[PDB]
Amino acid sequence: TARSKVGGSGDQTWVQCDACLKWRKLPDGMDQLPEKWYCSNNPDPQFRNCEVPEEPE
Ligand SMILES: [Zn+2]
To answer: Which organs or tissues contain this protein?
Structure first.
């Protein structure tokens, strides 16, 4: 199952891309974590390519 973490402040879960290992803010409204998750899965088009730098926090 795709790896997730909760940010230290507690306001945001992040999911790790199984290809590039960057952490992406978890898309809202997901019914489940998939077996593998990639930037390419992101409903947010700004964080859909592994080359996009990882957001802070
Ligand atoms: Zn990626």
So the answer is: Expressed in heart, placenta, skeletal muscle, brain, pancreas, lung, liver, but not kidney.
